[PDB]
Design a protein around this ligand. Structure first.
Ligand SMILES: O=C(c1ccc(O)c(C(=O)n2cc3ccccc3c2)c1)n1cc2ccccc2c1
Ligand SMILES: O=C(c1ccc(O)c(C(=O)n2cc3ccccc3c2)c1)n1cc2ccccc2c1
Length: 454
């Protein structure tokens, strides 16, 4: 076993009593009076803060020329004392930060603070800043208007938080319960995590890496994990952006064709906020028509305690829809043959998306993915609507199409045969849902879609 948590700290003198500012007292009073059904979330908040403190220290030490100490997160349960403790060897807090900041700090407020009092009769904290010459401090509070601070000896650099659990929260002093909570929400924490001296099995959050650094074998492993799949991904989009929102995401299209299970999926993409799980499922992380996509979306703009269907989620969904459409357009130009197979396999999702979309601009965006045969191209070759539009002859302002079972029947339509005399291109559409798709699309790039047979 590898444990660092023990009672090394002592206080030589008396504590100083301070009162919380009224607004922090306000939020603490809300916590004491409220009914929370998801009390386990304090653990993921504490682990996230510990990770942030370790990253702050590591980046600072590497920026200087300094050796790196042991950088770890430890949890300890004590059923006899009814406690759960977290300790990390990160940057710690100064006395000023303990006195003034607690309750009002952002994560990108008070993460780990209000949620600790949700489960605690009282909280006992030791912290010592990593800055040279820093002294250790003890901070104590029962979550009422008062907290205490005192200089403490025997404090290790970093922070230790001891939660003396409430009567109805003793489940968090059981190792097995805590282990399951960690695995559920905190499995991708990026520093070593130990529970009661045992290293926890955690996973690598490859979505946080620079896209150019992730190799195909790593994507294949991660795809198989997140999709619970045995094939390989036919497409991979690793999308990282800082504007208008923070996004670190990986999207995969399966090699296999869609089955009845992918069409009826309840859970397509997992949602994280800086490596803290928010939902294994995805309400509408992506549009419904993109439910065939597997993978992960991480946005630190997502706050840690939620319930969704917010403006933030809607904005994220719209950004991701545009980026995925752009990706598929880019893939069609990189490898048209592979894209044609993707459209054959997954194109009913695009047609669905056009039919169900509310906004004309979204319909036309999705329609950029459609590929059809054309009277003007060799049998079997596909064209896009924009390529058709680029070939339109002066004086002809509509996009003409014909739905038929196959190319032979299309070419022998008496309507098409007559039109051929005047050079007008006609799209040939062989999928049974093409009629509805193009009826709903109605127009593309301000050009009306006209079926050459009524
Ligand atoms: O959740 C925490 C917490 C946990 C682990 C930590 O390591 C720190 C810390 O020392 N940090 C975190 C940082 C993140 C970014 C930069 C520096 C940082 C220093 C803070 N609470 C501490 C409490 C103290 C009192 C009450 C509730 C509390 C909850
Ligand atoms: O009155 C018609 C009608 C009559 C003759 C037609 O030839 C067409 C047609 O399909 N065209 C005409 C074209 C002229 C130029 C180019 C292409 C063209 C395709 C349509 N209805 C069809 C109905 C179908 C259902 C219900 C009422 C309907 C009435």
């Amino acid at each position: 076993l590898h444990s660092i948590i023990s009672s090394t700290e002592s206080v030589q003198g008396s504590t100083s009593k301070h009162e919380f500012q009224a607004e922090t007292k306000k939020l603490l009073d809300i916590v004491a009076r409220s009914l929370y059904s998801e009390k386990e979330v304090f653990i993921r908040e504490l682990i996230s803060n510990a990770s942030d403190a370790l990253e702050k220290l590591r980046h600072k030490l590497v920026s200087d020329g300094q050796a790196l100490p042991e950088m770890e997160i430890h949890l300890q349960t004590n059923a006899e004392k009814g406690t759960i403790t977290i300790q990390d060897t990160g940057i710690g807090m100064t006395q000023e930060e303990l006195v003034s900041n607690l309750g009002t700090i952002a994560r990108s407020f008070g993460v780990g603070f209000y949620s600790a009092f949700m489960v605690a009769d009282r909280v006992e904290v030791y912290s010592r800043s990593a800055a040279p010459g820093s002294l250790g401090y003890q901070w104590l509070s029962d979550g009422s208007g008062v907290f205490e601070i005192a200089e403490a000896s025997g404090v290790r650099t970093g922070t230790k938080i001891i939660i003396h659990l409430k009567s109805d929260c003793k489940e968090f002093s059981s190792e097995a319960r805590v282990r399951d909570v960690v695995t559920k929400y905190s499995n991708f924490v990026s520093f070593p995590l130990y529970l009661n001296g045992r290293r926890m099995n955690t996973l690598q959050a490859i979505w946080m890496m620079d896209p150019k650094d992730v190799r195909e074998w790593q994507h294949e492993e991660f795809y198989r994990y997140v999709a619970q799949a045995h094939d390989k991904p036919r497409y991979t989009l690793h999308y990282k952006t800082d504007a208008p929102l923070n996004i670190r995401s990986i999207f995969y299209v399966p090699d296999m064709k869609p089955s009845m299970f992918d069409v009826s999926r309840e859970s397509s993409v997992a949602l994280y906020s800086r490596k803290v799980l928010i939902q294994t499922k995805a309400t509408d992380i992506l549009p419904k028509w993109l439910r065939f996509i597997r993978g992960v979306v991480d946005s630190e703009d997502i706050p840690l305690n939620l319930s969704q269907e917010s403006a933030l989620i809607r904005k994220l969904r719209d950004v991701l829809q545009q980026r995925l459409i752009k990706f598929f357009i880019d893939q069609s130009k990189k490898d048209a043959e592979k894209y044609a197979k993707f459209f054959e396999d997954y194109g009913l999702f695009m047609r669905e998306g056009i039919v169900t979309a509310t906004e004309q601009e979204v319909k036309e965006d999705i329609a950029k993915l459609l590929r059809y045969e054309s009277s003007a191209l060799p049998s079997g070759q596909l064209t896009s609507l924009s390529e058709y539009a680029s070939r339109m002859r002066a004086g002809t302002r509509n996009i003409y199409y014909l739905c038929a079972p196959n190319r032979h029947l299309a070419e022998h339509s008496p309507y098409y045969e007559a039109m051929k005399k005047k050079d007008t291109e006609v799209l040939f559409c062989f999928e049974q849902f093409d009629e509805l798709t193009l009826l709903h699309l109605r127009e593309f790039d301000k050009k009306k879609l006209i079926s050459v047979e009524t």
